[PDB]
Symmetry: D2
Subunit: 121 residues, 4 copies
């Protein structure tokens, strides 16, 4: 396995855990995501994700979408995978979380922003 | 159904997006022709992948575009709204990640913005 | 007055209004923000802002902070003032709204992001 | 001095330093920001900031603007000051950096987003 293939198990600074499947020839992948935190944390369940990474660069950019199975929200993550001289991989990401609102007039309220660093589990 | 993302959309910048069939889990692929880029002479049609909620009449959704002509990747997240006349609008916010050479330069690498899409 | 001096009265695309006073020699200004929207819209009242713009540029960047007087939140706006050939000014802004949470462990949830375009009030 | 008065000297995770002066009755303050990073770090100079914090809350929110004195850019920071059981203060912030572009048609490219945590010097 080449470094910065997203395939494998990762966690982040909030305690969330992500598993990513095989990455195909075009950089596409699926996975699962167990968030440590939510608007309603009692409701949390494992949720699916789908994304794409670049493959030429040793330190590729990537993004993915998480369809939360327990709420009407969706999150997206985008970032770059870095490798240090010891071979330690870190995903540096920023994210947007979209809430569902019932009226288009309330759109302004509905997007949160943040960051997460992921390392191999 | 209204707010099935399948079809052709454009946005306020002139970009054009086509989305394929949405499967039972809300997954879809598509293509994106951006009207703008860091190097607009290099723009080519690029692939996207994402997921929408299915039940809601006004579902949230997300997708990733893998730009085929740069090292960058963008993600879009938003909600599809339908007014009482039947008109659909995708209200989105996006992040664009640029590639940097070293982890110490990570702070510089993420742009944020917005786009509204309507059917082409 | 110069185009893109922030001094004056501005509308945005959510129906909000702000009025900004004189911009000093360092680009600093104060004003009052009247939001059309909020987490608790029945509590809305006018709220103070404070910011800085670049002064020399024909199309300057700027930023400001709004201290909401009716909640524990603070918002910041950053953007650029553009002037078209007819003299029409547009403030293209992006914003972050910070909500107050009680525990550092909930920090991840606390920052909303969005955009606003402002134009000068007519007359 | 009460905890989470912003007056004083702070640094962040990138190594940037800021010094904030007296906070007035309305929560207003000024100061100097010394960024550790820039598009061109050989051009970095001391730059002014101006902001407002809430005063009554034990863990107040606040924001400030930095007018960079060595580029046409402006940055804004927004966050909350937290105090732990031992009295240690942390400012958890997110920021936007606006770059100057030539025309309104280029506006889409002009805004970076990020995060910083500050602690007292
Ligand atoms: O709250 C919800 O309804 C869905 C879960 C949202 C979890 C968010 S996604 C961004 C941040 N990073 C995480 O690992 N969890 C939160
Ligand atoms: O510049 C690049 O290298 C890739 C193209 C990025 C285009 C961005 S994605 C966000 C914004 N919305 C658009 O339709 N195009 C731009
Ligand atoms: O909800 C609150 O407690 C305070 C008001 C927040 C209003 C926000 S700031 C960003 C957006 N633009 C506006 O003109 N109003 C909203
Ligand atoms: O590059 C420039 O033209 C001005 C300096 C920008 C520095 C940014 S502001 C956000 C981030 N946090 C910092 O402490 N510095 C960078």
């Amino acid at each position: 396995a080449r470094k910065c293939s997203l395939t494998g198990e990762w966690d982040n600074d909030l305690g969330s855990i992500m598993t990513i499947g095989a990455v195909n020839d075009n950089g596409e992948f699926d996975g699962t995501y167990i968030t440590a935190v939510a608007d309603n944390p009692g409701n949390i369940t494992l949720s699916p994700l789908l994304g794409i990474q670049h493959k030429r660069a040793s330190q590729p950019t990537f993004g993915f979408t998480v369809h939360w199975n327990f709420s009407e929200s969706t999150s997206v993550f985008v970032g770059q995978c870095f490798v240090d001289r010891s071979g330690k991989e870190v995903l540096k990401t920023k994210w947007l979380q979209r809430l569902a609102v019932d009226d288009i007039s309330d759109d302004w309220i509905a997007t949160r922003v943040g960051n997460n660093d992921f390392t191999r589990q």
